[PDB]
């Protein structure tokens, strides 16, 4: 269950 | 290092950080219904969450939290930040809000949409507010970067701490910036004050109209007018309303 | 005019004369019997709070409509604030009443919004904020919320929040006055007044989601509220 | 509306 956002804060 | 930036510096990085502004997917070939006006302004915030997520990482201090803490601020900001962007592009635009260069609406043109118009009339206050006030540029910046720190801020072991009191030395710096600002365009000592206390009063506003604006998004989620994207249906089940 | 003409001490002076007083509530908790205690006590704090905003230099200045609206949008704040300032040196606490002095960790929703209480009465508590500051943010509190609300576009409403914000900017330079006589230097004074301005922001965010607990709890009609509170809480769904 | 009005002139 991992965040859109907590990914997107990676890119 | 947010901490050893000057003012002017600070200023500078923040200014060099603004997104663009992006246009609606209007189609000037139908009327709006509810549905297809509320799907253009969430179609519009889809695509604007993602330069906002890069505009954060360039806020000074924001790369330095944790990822955690760093998607915490942003799902406790990001409706005020979208928000405030909306207030600023439509000051010199009375009785209209500039959701996007193609589509600029009045309050008349909010009621097609059930509950909206309230939340227009809060828009249409606010930047009335800023015009008034003559905000600048700069101004608006410093104000929509504070949104971003201070907005979850007291939501946040001691390491937790050490992230709360880094995040306070920030937002005094930006305080700084402020009064910086103030004081290179002329404003008297007690001008300064006067006027620092002006601008934050309109962040209480600002939390005030995403409060509201969350509600009403909710409830446009929950009668089935529009569907929303993962993300935008991520940022706001953070706010857990019913 | 009494208030523009007013020195810095004296609006102190007058803000903590104004002051309301510290009421008491009404053996184990129900969920039924702990929100009846608190809805019992903000009603009888209301009838206070009126009191003290007539008190409030600038206040009766204003239109019967005007103070209304101020009330209507301000009040859950004020509550707030009052309830956060009297918890301070409680930790973990929040001080309703000398009598009912709760924990965070039984009422479906409150939980979120008592952990937001004790992050603010956290934050006051780490500012050492002093009862002469709180004073100025609770009358802030009551002055600006509803400010940008008011409707009408005529010349008899610009003129009216016109004197509301000379009325803001006169309790600007009272809180500003407290931090210069307390020592802090100019930088300390404008960044303490924004830490404190900051936290309007998060007492705002408080009573929004209070409101919403407390329209529910309408709805859902088992906790008894007063003709009162209804008429208060009527008028956020509006 | 009106309790609020009466509280406010008594
Ligand atoms: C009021 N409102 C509701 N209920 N849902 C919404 N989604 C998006 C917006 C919005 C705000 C500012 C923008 O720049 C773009 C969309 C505004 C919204
Ligand atoms: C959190 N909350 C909700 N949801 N409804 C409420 N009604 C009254 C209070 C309250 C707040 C401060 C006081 O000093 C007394 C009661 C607090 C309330």
């Known amino acids: 269950k991992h965040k859109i956002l907590h990914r997107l804060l990676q890119d | 290092l947010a901490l050893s930036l000057t003012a002017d510096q600070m200023v500078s990085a923040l200014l060099d950080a603004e997104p663009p502004i992006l ?4 189609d000037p070939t139908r009327p709006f219904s509810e549905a297809s006006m509320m799907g253009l302004l969430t179609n519009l915030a889809d ?4 330069h906002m997520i890069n505009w954060a990482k360039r806020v000074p201090g924001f790369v330095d939290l944790t990822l955690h803490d760093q998607v915490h601020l942003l799902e406790c900001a990001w409706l005020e930040i979208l928000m405030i962007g909306l207030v600023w592009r439509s ?3 009375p009785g209209k809000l500039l959701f996007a260069p193609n589509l600029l609406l009045d309050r008349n043109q909010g009621k097609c949409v059930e509950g909206m118009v309230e939340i227009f009339d809060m828009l249409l206050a606010t930047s009335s507010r800023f015009r008034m006030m003559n905000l600048q540029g700069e101004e ?3 104000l929509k970067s504070i949104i ?3 907005s979850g801020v007291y939501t946040f072991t001691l390491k937790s701490l050490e992230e709360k009191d880094h995040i306070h030395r920030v937002l005094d710096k930006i305080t700084d910036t402020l009064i910086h600002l103030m004081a290179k365009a002329g404003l008297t000592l007690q001008q300064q004050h006067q ?3 002006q601008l934050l009063l309109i962040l209480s506003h600002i939390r005030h ?3 509201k604006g969350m509600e009403h998004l909710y409830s446009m989620k929950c009668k089935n007018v529009v569907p929303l994207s993962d993300l935008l249906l991520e940022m706001l089940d ?3 309303l019913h």
């Not at chain 2, 246009?23 to 209007?26: L, R």
């Open chain 2, 140 to 142: 608006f910046v410093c």
């Open chain 2, 23 to 26: 246009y609606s997917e209007y």
């Open chain 2, 91 to 93: 000051m010199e635009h």
């Open chain 2, 148 to 150: 971003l720190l201070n």
């Open chain 2, 47 to 50: 695509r604007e969450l993602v």
């Open chain 2, 238 to 240: 953070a706010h857990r």
């Open chain 2, 209 to 211: 109209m995403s409060n």
């Open chain 2, 195 to 197: 006027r620092l206390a």
